[PDB]
Design a protein around this ligand. Structure first.
Ligand code: HEM
Length: 407
C-alpha cells in the first residue's frame, strides 16, 4: 500500500560487508576507513545498531580496555548473523571470558604454544606439508588446493597438538566447517553438538587410558583436580581444534591467490627466502581474515575521542579496516612484502591476542617455502573472477581453489 519513496542513504551502513576481491576491503569498508574518527555506527543483520572501530590506535586502546567485555552470552553482545545465537546459548571457552577467569583457563593451554614448542614442531610441520604435497602432485594435473592441501595440513598439525586422532578427520573437519560457516542457528548448534559429543567420548577414553597431547594433559591434570569443568574442557578443545583448522587454511588459499596476482613480489620472494617471514606478516596484515573475532560489549560508558560508547552497546573492532590505517602503513592498500607490517592487528591485541599466532606463522612460512620449492610453476586453474569468496559473517577465504602446474 506504500513503499520507501525517499533517498536511502544511511549513516549506519549494513555490517558486515562481503569481499568482492580476496585482498581488498569491501567497498563499504573502504568508506568506513576514510571517515575521520575512531568509531562509526553500523546496522547489524537484525536491525540493532552497533559501533565499529575503524582506526589502528583506537583499535589497540579498545581491545586493551577491560570495560569492553568478550562475554558472548551477554544479551547485548553484537551478533552479526542469526547463527551467532548458537554461540550465545552454548558454553564458552576462554575466548569468551574476561579477567580473571580468562587467564586461569588460557594458562592451561599456553605450554603447547610457546616459542620453544613451536620450534620443536617444525619437523612435523614440514613433514605434514611435504607429505600432502607429495600426494596432491601425484594425484592429478589439477587439484583443489583447499581440500587437498590448505585444510588437511593445519588439521593434522593441530590434531597432533591436541591429541585428537586424525582417523576421525572426515567427521570433525566437516563439523568444523559447518559450525564456522553456518548461516542459521540450527545448523550451527547441530555442528557444535556433533563436535561436543565426539570430544566428550575422547575425554572418557583418556580417563581410562591417559592420552597424548593437550586434551590428554587437561584430562589427567586440571580435570582430575576439578580446576576445569568437563564442559569447559570440551569447549576449550573445540575452540583450539576449529581455530587451528580454519584460520591457517584460509591464509594459505588467500595468500596463493594474492601472491599470484602480484607476480613481481612473488618472484622476489622466491629469489630470497629470508623475505618469507616478513611476507607472512604483510599477508597477515593485508588479508586480515578474522574480523568475526572483534566483537565486544561495553560494561560501562567509554569516551573515545569525543564519542561515547554507552554501557550495553555492542562494539566490533574491525581489524581489517584498522590494518589499512594509512597513518600506520603508508599506502595501506598496496601489498608490499618489503614493508614493515609490525603492529598489525590480524591477531588482535591484548589479553585475547591469538594464542596460535606463532604456530600460524610457522605453518605459513613452511607452506610458502614448500610451494616455491616443490611447485614453482603453480598457477590458478580458473580466473580469479570465477572464485567464490565466503561472506563477511565468517572467516574470510574460498571454499574451493582450482590450481594446476607443470607435470
Ligand atoms: C592463521 C591465522 C590466524 C588468525 C588471523 C587468527 C586471528 C585471531 C584473532 C584476531 C584473535 C583475537 C580474538 C578476540 O580478540 O576475540 C584470535 C584469538 C585466538 N586464536 Fe587465533 N588466529 C589465527 C590462527 C590461530 C591458530 C592456528 C590457533 C590454534 C589453536 C588459534 C587459536 C586462537 C585462540 C585459542 C584464540 C583465543 C585467545 C584468547 O581468547 O585468549 N588461532 N585469533
Amino acid at each position: 500500500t506504500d513503499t520507501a519513496t525517499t533517498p536511502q542513504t544511511t549513516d549506519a551502513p549494513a555490517f558486515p560487508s562481503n569481499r568482492s576481491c580476496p585482498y581488498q576491503l569491501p567497498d563499504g569498508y573502504a568508506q568506513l576507513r576514510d571517515t575521520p574518527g575512531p568509531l562509526h555506527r553500523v546496522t547489524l543483520y537484525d536491525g540493532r545498531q552497533a559501533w565499529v572501530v575503524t582506526k589502528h590506535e583506537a583499535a589497540r586502546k579498545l581491545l586493551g580496555d577491560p570495560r569492553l567485555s568478550s562475554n558472548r552470552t551477554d544479551d547485548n553482545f553484537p551478533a552479526t548473523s542469526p547463527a551467532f545465537e548458537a554461540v550465545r546459548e552454548s558454553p564458552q571457552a576462554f575466548i569468551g571470558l574476561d579477567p580473571p577467569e580468562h587467564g586461569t583457563r588460557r594458562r592451561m593451554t599456553i605450554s603447547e604454544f610457546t616459542v620453544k614448542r613451536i620450534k620443536g614442531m617444525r619437523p612435523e610441520v614440514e613433514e605434514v606439508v611435504h607429505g600432502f604435497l607429495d600426494e596432491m602432485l601425484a594425484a592429478g594435473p589439477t587439484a583443489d588446493l583447499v581440500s587437498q592441501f590448505a585444510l588437511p595440513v593445519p588439521s593434522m598439525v593441530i590434531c597432533r597438538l591436541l591429541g585428537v586422532p586424525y582417523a576421525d578427520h572426515e567427521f570433525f573437519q566437516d563439523a568444523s566447517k559447518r559450525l564456522v560457516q553456518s548461516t542459521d542457528a540450527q545448523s550451527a548448534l547441530t555442528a557444535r553438538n556433533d563436535l561436543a559429543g565426539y570430544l566428550d567420548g575422547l575425554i572418557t577414553q583418556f580417563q581410562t587410558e591417559p592420552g597424548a597431547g593437550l586434551v590428554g594433559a587437561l584430562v589427567a591434570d586440571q580435570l582430575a583436580n576439578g580446576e576445569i569443568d568437563r564442559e569447559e574442557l570440551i569447549s576449550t578443545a573445540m575452540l583450539l581444534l576449529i581455530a587451528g583448522h580454519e584460520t591457517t587454511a584460509s591464509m594459505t588459499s588467500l595468500s596463493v591467490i594474492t601472491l599470484l596476482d602480484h607476480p613481481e613480489q612473488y618472484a622476489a620472494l622466491r629469489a630470497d627466502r629470508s623475505l618469507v617471514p616478513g611476507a607472512v606478516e604483510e599477508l597477515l596484515r593485508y588479508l586480515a581474515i578474522a574480523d568475526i573475532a572483534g566483537g565486544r560489549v561495553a560494561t560501562a560508558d567509554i569516551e573515545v575521542e569525543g564519542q561515547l560508547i554507552r554501557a550495553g552497546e555492542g562494539v566490533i573492532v574491525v581489524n581489517s579496516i584498522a590494518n589499512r590505517d594509512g597513518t600506520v602503513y603508508e599506502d595501506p592498500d598496496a601489498l608490499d612484502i618489503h614493508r614493515s607490517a609490525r603492529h598489525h592487528l590480524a591477531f588482535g591485541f591484548g589479553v585475547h591476542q591469538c594464542l596460535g599466532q606463532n604456530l600460524a606463522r610457522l605453518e605459513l612460512e613452511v607452506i610458502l617455502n614448500a610451494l616455491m620449492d616443490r611447485v614453482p610453476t603453480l598457477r590458478l586453474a580458473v580466473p580469479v573472477e570465477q572464485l567464490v569468496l565466503r561472506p563477511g559473517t565468517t572467516i574470510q577465504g574460498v571454499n574451493e581453489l582450482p590450481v594446476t602446474w607443470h607435470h
